[model samples]
Target: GITTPEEMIEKAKGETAYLPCKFTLSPEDQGPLDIEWLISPADNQKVDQVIILYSGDKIYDDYYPDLKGRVHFTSNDLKSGDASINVTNLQLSDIGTYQCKVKKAPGVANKKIHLVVLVKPSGA
Candidate 1:
């Protein structure tokens, strides 16, 4: 099963966002775990881009240039099932539907988190 803070979240520019995703494996399905973060354009016609991924011992975060350093999974120990991610220095280009996928052995689950980046509030 999976859990999240919300289905959609909003963040202001220059602020950081706690994009959340959580999961739990079935009773007997615990094994090597994998986590993935994919993004769908705000318009979301069809294509989804893979951004960050974790394969038990290593994390692949360089697939996307813009979000490579800004995004990260919250925990170094993934077995705790804390798949939530954090994005720093939020910007307008971050608005989109981001999907979280986790699979351990045969326990598979995925869901989308729609993020809205609001305009800067100060000096306007």
Candidate 2:
């Protein structure tokens, strides 16, 4: 229940940030949701995968080319249940800790959300 970093991007000076991955599911536990968003980077085999949007549209349109178009999904109103995820133009190689692997079906649960992309150099 904690996530922060309003702005940060420093991979040689191309900045962008919108690191926010939220969660909350309690619709009487009517399972059948395979929501997965993972990125355990820092040079450990290189795994950056997340192009899934649900209850609104666009569920993985072959997105993986370094997150084409900077990748973004602001959870489209979901009628009421807000299973969140809003990643805008956040770069700096998109730092680490971005995992939302939820396989709520017959019996399975998972959680891991940690992000930190920093550059810090803006004040006028």
Candidate 3:
């Protein structure tokens, strides 16, 4: 599990936070891969909910009614196993523990993402 983060500007109101999710697959692993972005700090179950943007090739359109049209995949190069997400319009309320799950080659890996949203009084 390889988790990456994007740093927003100071007092970066209305800025986007992009967390890159990436992984590799064993050559022996077979079948299509499934990537997921799960809300962490809770039991890893379906009730925990999956990010609509990163679900298995289908957008649910309901799970994240607030995140509609703003969530997207940074890249999913199956050839290289990069299943990252680009989340935009980040708000202070968006702060939370998030983990990325990579499913491939009969194994799973976890990547953690922690975003810091700050308030800058001085304008750049």
Candidate 4:
């Protein structure tokens, strides 16, 4: 099973956003695990970008230009089932729907999270 604690995430520009996604594994899901995060413009069904990916015991963090070097999985130890991610240097154009997909030879799980990037008023 896959779970998204924060289905909707709002963050100001330049702030790093922590996108929460968790995956539960059963005995049947002992196969190699894969975690990939994708995004779409607004609510469009087809994914428009790949945020990051982990498969074949490799980390593919560069995908979308906006998130190329700014996004990554929070846990390098995926065996702990922490599929969450963090995006730094946020931009308003980064706002959209993000989908977290986890795959095992015996199971597949996916969940969505909405990221809202806004301006942070400056005050003295």
Candidate 5:
């Protein structure tokens, strides 16, 4: 039984956070890959908002105001199952749960990560 582990990613208020989610698929399953990035506020799962959608070689619209131009791939190797994205310009509102869902032919993989934005105290 494969269990999905919870990962805690912490970052300062203004730094970029690299939310990692990767998997290796069989070489024979060399088909168009579907990678979807989703997010929701902390303590909420009903809000499965789509952050970005990558199908084949096309990247669809990112409807979030804060996510515009702030979300991008860490690598161009989607065929190698590198479904990681970097969320830049972190803010307190950016604190939430992110999920990376990948699909290639008969293979499917998903990962979830929780992000915590640490606020700098007073003058620190």
Candidate 6:
């Protein structure tokens, strides 16, 4: 199925946006959780920008200067299937497509969210 900005989430410029990416798995079957956040231009032309990688007790967020110190996982409980992330100090340049990949015992789950940063009109 296709995902749209409105259907996902929207945030005004300079505000924070919470792009959700969750999963559901049984407790007993829980295993190592791997989550990655990727970004792509609005044109979807260039290669995807690898933002961060969260593996249960580890985090590797060394990508994209525009996203440095501005992005992180929403929760620390990966075993619960909470792979959502939070983006702070949003900017117009931040507008694009985000892909969240969650890997657990069962399998891998992917969720994409289109982010649109609303800017003020020509004049306020």
Can you write out model 1's per-residue Cα lDDT over 6-58, one digit (the tens) per residue? 48877789898887787877887767788889887664464478889998578
* Tens-digit lDDT string for candidate 4 (1-124): 7865548888889999998888888889878989889999663445657878898988887677756788888887976787888988888878899888888878888888888887893321
Error of 3 at 12 (Å): 3.2
Best by lDDT: 4
Tens-place lDDT digits, model 2, residues 11-117: 22245444444444554546655555666666456765665545223356345566566655556653233344655556666666666554444433444555555
TM-score of each: 0.86, 0.29, 0.69, 0.87, 0.82, 0.79
RMSD of 3: 5.0
* Candidate 4 ranges with C-alpha deviation above 4 Å: 43-48, 121-124
lDDT (CA) for every model shown?
Answer: 0.80, 0.50, 0.58, 0.82, 0.77, 0.75
Please list the Cα RMSD from the true structure of every candidate, rounded to 1 decimal place. 2.9, 12.5, 5.0, 3.2, 3.6, 4.1
* After superposition, candidate 3 runs with Cα above 4 Å error: 1-11, 40-47, 53-62, 76-79, 121-124
- The C-alpha stretches of model 6 lying farther than 4 A from their native spots are 1-6, 26-31, 121-124
lDDT of 5 by residue, 55-118 (tens): 8588875766667888998888765657778999888888898888888777777888998887
| Candidate 2 vs 6: which has more lDDT | 6
TM-score order of candidates, top first? 4, 1, 5, 6, 3, 2
Positional deviation of residue 111's Cα in model 4 after best superposition, in angstroms: 1.2
Q: Show model 1 residue runs off by greater than 4 Å.
A: 43-46, 121-124
Local lDDT at 52 for model 2: 50
Local error of candidate 3 at 122, Å?
8.7
Expressed as tens digits, the lDDT of each residue in 2-113 for candidate 6 is: 1222245567888898987767765553667777888986644755789999865789997877789999888877656677788998888888888887776666667888
Error of 3 at 100 (Å): 0.8
